[PDB]
Amino acid sequence: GRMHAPGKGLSQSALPYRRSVPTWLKLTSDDVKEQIYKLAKKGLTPSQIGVILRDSHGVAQVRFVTGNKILRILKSKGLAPDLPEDLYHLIKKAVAVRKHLERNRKDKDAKFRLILIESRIHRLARYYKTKRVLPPNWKYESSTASALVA
Amino acid sequence: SAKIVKPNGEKPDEFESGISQALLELEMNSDLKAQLRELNITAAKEIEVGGGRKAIIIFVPVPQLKSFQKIQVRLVRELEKKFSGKHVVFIAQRRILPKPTRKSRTKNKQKRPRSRTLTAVHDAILEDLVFPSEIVGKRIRVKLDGSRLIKVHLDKAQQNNVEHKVETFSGVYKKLTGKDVNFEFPEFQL
Amino acid sequence: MQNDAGEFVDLYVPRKCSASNRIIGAKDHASIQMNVAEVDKVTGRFNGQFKTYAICGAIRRMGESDDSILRLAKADGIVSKNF
Amino acid sequence: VRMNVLADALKSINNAEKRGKRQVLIRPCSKVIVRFLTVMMKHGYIGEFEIIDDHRAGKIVVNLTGRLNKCGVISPRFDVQLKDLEKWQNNLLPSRQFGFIVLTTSAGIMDHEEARRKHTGGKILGFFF
Amino acid sequence: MPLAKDLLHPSPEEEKRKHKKKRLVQSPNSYFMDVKCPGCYKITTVFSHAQTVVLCVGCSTVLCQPTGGKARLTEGCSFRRKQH
RNA sequence: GCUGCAGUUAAAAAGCUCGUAGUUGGAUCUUGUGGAGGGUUCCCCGCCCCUUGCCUCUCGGCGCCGGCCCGAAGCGUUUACUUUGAAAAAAU
Numbered sequence: 103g104r105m106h107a108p109g110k111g112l113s114q115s116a117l118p119y120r121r122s123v124p125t126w127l128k129l130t131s132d133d134v135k136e137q138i139y140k141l142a143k144k145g146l147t148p149s150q151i152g153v154i155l156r157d158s159h160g161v162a163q164v165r166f167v168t169g170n171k172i173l174r175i176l177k178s179k180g181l182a183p184d185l186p187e188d189l190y191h192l193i194k195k196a197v198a199v200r201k202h203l204e205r206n207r208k209d210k211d212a213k214f215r216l217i218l219i220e221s222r223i224h225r226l227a228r229y230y231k232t233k234r235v236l237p238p239n240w241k242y243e244s245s246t247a248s249a250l251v252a
Numbered sequence: 253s254a255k256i257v258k259p260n261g262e263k264p265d266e267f268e269s270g271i272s273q274a275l276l277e278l279e280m281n282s283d284l285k286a287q288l289r290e291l292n293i294t295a296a297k298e299i300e301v302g303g304g305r306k307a308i309i310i311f312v313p314v315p316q317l318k319s320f321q322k323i324q325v326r327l328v329r330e331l332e333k334k335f336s337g338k339h340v341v342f343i344a345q346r347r348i349l350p351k352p353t354r355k356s357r358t359k360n361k362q363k364r365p366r367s368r369t370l371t372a373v374h375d376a377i378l379e380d381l382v383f384p385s386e387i388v389g390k391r392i393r394v395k396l397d398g399s400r401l402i403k404v405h406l407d408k409a410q411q412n413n414v415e416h417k418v419e420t421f422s423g424v425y426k427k428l429t430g431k432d433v434n435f436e437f438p439e440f441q442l
Numbered sequence: 443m444q445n446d447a448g449e450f451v452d453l454y455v456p457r458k459c460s461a462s463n464r465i466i467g468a469k470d471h472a473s474i475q476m477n478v479a480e481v482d483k484v485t486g487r488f489n490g491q492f493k494t495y496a497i498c499g500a501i502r503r504m505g506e507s508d509d510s511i512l513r514l515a516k517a518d519g520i521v522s523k524n525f
Numbered sequence: 526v527r528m529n530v531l532a533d534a535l536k537s538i539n540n541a542e543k544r545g546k547r548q549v550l551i552r553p554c555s556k557v558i559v560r561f562l563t564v565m566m567k568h569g570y571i572g573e574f575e576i577i578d579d580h581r582a583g584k585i586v587v588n589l590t591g592r593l594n595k596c597g598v599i600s601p602r603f604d605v606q607l608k609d610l611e612k613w614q615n616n617l618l619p620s621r622q623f624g625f626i627v628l629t630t631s632a633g634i635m636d637h638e639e640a641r642r643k644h645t646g647g648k649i650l651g652f653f654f
Numbered sequence: 655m656p657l658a659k660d661l662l663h664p665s666p667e668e669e670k671r672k673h674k675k676k677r678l679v680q681s682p683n684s685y686f687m688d689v690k691c692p693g694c695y696k697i698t699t700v701f702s703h704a705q706t707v708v709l710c711v712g713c714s715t716v717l718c719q720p721t722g723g724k725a726r727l728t729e730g731c732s733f734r735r736k737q738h
Numbered sequence: 739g740c741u742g743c744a745g746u747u748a749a750a751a752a753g754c755u756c757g758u759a760g761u762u763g764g765a766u767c768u769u770g771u772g773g774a775g776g777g778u779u780c781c782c783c784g785c786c787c788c789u790u791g792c793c794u795c796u797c798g799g800c801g802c803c804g805g806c807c808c809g810a811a812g813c814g815u816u817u818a819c820u821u822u823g824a825a826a827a828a829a830u
Contacts (some may be wrong), residue, residue: 354814357813357814358791369765370767399779429786
């Protein structure tokens with residue numbers, strides 16, 4: 103079930119058994135890497151590169167054409183960001199609710215939902231700090247949070 | 253030079269120098285001169301199959317094999333035409349490293365890659381034999397005596413390229429790994 | 443049941459259900475024994491020869507005896523492995 | 526969440542045997558499940574079985590013969606020594622004449638009668654009769 | 655389900671009816687197709703559950719629009735699946 | 739009540755949700771032929787790929803007409819588990 107809601111829905115992707123590239127695909131490994139390097143200059147995060155490539159080109163799974171996952175391809179050229187994808191989007195969501203509560207102090211539902219976002223930031227940062235993606239002295243703060251996404 | 257097969261001390265054998273001569277002389281005609289370049293064949297053998305006939309196995313080094321498969325559809329058809337009624341397969345020169353935990357010397361200074369495990373090598377050898385066709389799925393049957401059989405499903409397109417060689421695939425995989433395999437076609441596939 | 447001299451010591455050996463391989467008890471009054479006629483292959487007529495099955499009372503009351511008798515009659519030659 | 530896979534496999538067989546079904550599907554598969562099934566099959570309590578590859582841990586289909594009264598798991602994998610094995614078979618078995626405890630030992634997964642011939646102790650996995 | 659149906663050989667009409675994650679082995683319902691338009695005729699490839707508003711190499715303003723399920727084509731000349 | 743109890747109505751589930759310590763945590767990384775004891779395939783030797791996994795010294799006996807071999811040692815990533823040795827008053 104979901105970690106902070108009573109729901110237990112089932113929707114997700116389902117990959118095929120066959121890992122091979124199909125015979126009709128015209129692209130090749132190093133031309134797929136150059137298209138990844140061009141899309142990264144526009145500020146697109148790794149999750150957005152994979153949908154642009156799936157929708158408008160033949161590549162269903164980049165990992166099956168090129169033997170690497172696309173965050174590794176960007177890191178080996180220094181093109182990847184420092185703060186990771188999901189922790190960036192969680193911190194960007196918490197500053198929007200805090201801008202609401204400064205003028206709407208009667209909104210007790212918004213007060214409750216902010217506890218459930220910031221406790222999910224603390225759980226994900228504690229994971230990245232043990233795997234050396236973040237400094238041991240890294241800390242989310244309710245005053246500093248606006249400066250993390252500028 | 254000729255006699256390209258095997259490490260020092262093993263090289264002079266008549267059969268294996270014969271197959272490697274028959275490979276390296278074929279670059280001299282104008283068609284395969286466009287696409288062969290004296291590329292290494294590491295070994296070859298001639299082996300018995302269940303009908304009382306014979307077949308040959310050719311061993312190719314890993315960084316060369318991605319180029320051999322791109323021309324194998326003509327190159328094996330020329331070799332199966334030239335030899336005396338034989339069947340041919342190309343396979344990779346894979347190495348297995350031993351289990352580090354209490355079955356080898358081990359230390360922190362180098363780690364065994366999972367690409368060098370026995371399981372990752374034996375299930376890659378199965379893909380080389382069938383090459384003109386693609387594996388659609390596997391099943392394993394355990395018998396009342398405690399033995400195993402593997403059932404392999406092959407794609408329904410390209411039947412004409414492999415149906416006459418399933419009887420050599422079982423005998424070759426038996427002699428490369430010690431295991432019984434059957435090759436079959438699906439009822440339907442999604 | 444046998445002893446170390448190899449002789450048998452049960453009162454009787456009870457029957458088992460043909461569909462299910464479980465023992466039919468002395469008070470299972472919902473259970474049955476079915477009996478079915480064989481016919482000669484030249485003229486389709488009764489020769490006095492027959493086949494038999496026994497069915498558990500628990501399988502009858504859940505409604506599974508009709509399909510069990512059919513599977514048994516296809517496993518023997520009677521329904522001839524086509525339908 | 527799913528804390529233990531062997532307990533699912535045996536509970537799934539045990540519910541199918543009591544309904545009188547002729548086959549059952551076990552998912553996820555494991556190296557421990559395939560070795561436990563093999564010990565029941567070698568003693569004659571189940572039929573033969575087949576494994577399906579799906580690239581995600583796999584599945585098993587098993588054939589049932591109607592002979593099995595029960596199979597089960599002891600959840601903490603307690604250690605046992607040869608002097609204490611008598612107390613466990615006095616607790617868990619229906620008679621001295623039939624039924625088996627299953628142990629894991631450094632000589633392999635095995636029947637509690639084989640552990641006495643091999644002079645070895647181990648950890649408890651489960652039982653059948 | 656009767657007492658005795660075998661589980662190793664589902665018919666293709668038993669398998670096509672059930673959810674993608676609950677089949678005997680998993681497989682997607684989505685597909686790739688090749689698409690073509692009037693005025694400029696360079697053929698292009700599209701995914702049937704697209705989220706992007708696709709623009710063709712022929713520079714027309716919309717090839718297809720996104721939707722809560724399958725994307726809908728702008729009356730293009732092909733909806734033909736690729737075979738594999 | 740560990741083995742081994744109970745909590746709809748007999749005694750008994752915090753009004754509801756978050757959360758640090760504590761307890762618990764998914765799949766995966768080397769096998770069959772030959773010989774002895776015993777069977778009609780598996781437990782001890784030697785093998786498809788590694789069988790103590792390596793290695794080459796030097797103080798130190800062996801085998802033979804200097805040189806090449808076979809028992810120590812560096813040691814096998816660290817522990818629980820299990821089986822075996824040693825060492826623990828008498829009386830009860």
